[PDB]
Design a protein around this ligand. Structure first.
Ligand code: CL
Ligand code: CL
Ligand code: CL
Ligand code: CL
Ligand code: CL
Ligand code: CL
Lengths: 227, 227
């Protein structure tokens, strides 16, 4: 718990389209081999791009290749495309019978919008603060609201705010929630305290209504909250 | 908490490609209006397809239309495509200042694979059982393993099983985990007890190695576990 050992790989690498990118990883047991796994977003499942140092799965383009040299391995992507943007995890094993990963290398390849943040792990009885940053429109003339969705459940209205600052809250969160807006920063904020397990879920900000869900024309991508 | 009121919409509707589908929803305050939101998978953010009874956002095809009649509204999709498969939520407001949703209507439009299930919400100190169902290959001749990923963290090896039944566990779960396989049912099972918050995350089954992550050529889609 207070100790960890992982494979070493770089945090990030940037490339223009069409370039050849190489990412190297080191560590693992002395005779170990290596694989590489692509995860295009934290919510998508990894896929293998290279296994056993240098083999491609059938569904992977030939522009992906790999090699091993000693206790290092290298992933090469020729002709990088925007679609190749992802975190690439190396994996292998230690000198014992345990699997090991690297921390992952993020590959970066060099309109009305709403962007939520502030979620993550939370303690029962604790509090959270979510913020949505809007852009691409006159923020001050729109009502805004938050909607959430518990794991394997439907959409639930949480709170909303009108253009004169009137606020409205769902019974589920009454007494514990505060929604506010900062027209200068084009942000809306949702504070929620005395967290319960029922507060767990994905939280979306959306534009157009405060309590009138029918007026919503634009949704953020959400932020996950786990109590 | 022991009471709920929502808009009424049907659980599901099935259609062949090219058909015109209509889904109707009822309820809400007497003068309320309605919107419709598409969610293609529980992990993707909703998007508005209709708002204010009958308006389409600019990025939505004209094959989507809506109408309101009294305290009912209807979503129509002409020329349904496979890509239209999704849950469609209606939304509006009550007679008071609160937003309301329906439970959502699932639209159904009429190889080596691994499919995990058994996750969801869990209580600290409780236990869980995840199962992966394999198909498309001779299951009994492959090593299999589970990997997890905590919110906003990297991949972590959990446990693996070889073709002779040898099992291997990460230190994080030693004493609390049991991995098993049923070659007859092409399933692998991960039991985990005395759950801690650190056990929260998405859990993947993958084919090819028990502790040798480099041998993995195929990944499941994952199952989420929240303690
Ligand atoms: Cl070794
Ligand atoms: Cl207002
Ligand atoms: Cl409103
Ligand atoms: Cl009314
Ligand atoms: Cl074995
Ligand atoms: Cl192995």
């Amino acid at each position: 718990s207070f100790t960890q050992a992982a494979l070493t790989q770089p945090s990030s690498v940037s490339a223009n389209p069409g370039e050849t990118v190489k990412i190297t990883c080191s560590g693992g047991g002395s005779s170990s081999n290596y694989g590489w796994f692509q995860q295009k977003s934290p919510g998508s499942a990894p896929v293998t791009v290279i296994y056993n140092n240098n083999n491609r799965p059938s569904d992977i383009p030939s522009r992906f290749s790999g090699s091993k040299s000693g206790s290092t391995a290298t992933l090469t992507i020729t002709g990088v495309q925007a679609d190749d943007e992802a975190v690439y995890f190396c994996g292998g094993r230690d000198s014992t019978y345990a699997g090991m990963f690297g921390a992952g290398t993020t590959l970066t390849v060099l309109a009305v919008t709403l962007d939520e943040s502030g979620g993550g792990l939370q303690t029962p009885g604790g509090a959270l603060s979510l913020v949505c940053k809007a852009s691409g429109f006159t923020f001050s003339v729109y009502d805004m609201m938050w909607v959430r969705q518990a794991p394997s459940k439907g959409l639930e209205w949480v709170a909303g705010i009108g253009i004169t600052g009137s606020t409205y809250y769902a019974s589920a969160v009454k007494g514990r929630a505060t929604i506010s807006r900062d027209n200068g920063q084009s942000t809306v904020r949702l504070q929620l305290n005395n967290l319960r397990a029922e507060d767990t879920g994905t939280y979306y900000c959306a534009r157009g209504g405060a309590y009138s869900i029918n007026k919503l024309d634009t949704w953020g991508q959400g932020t996950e909250v786990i109590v």
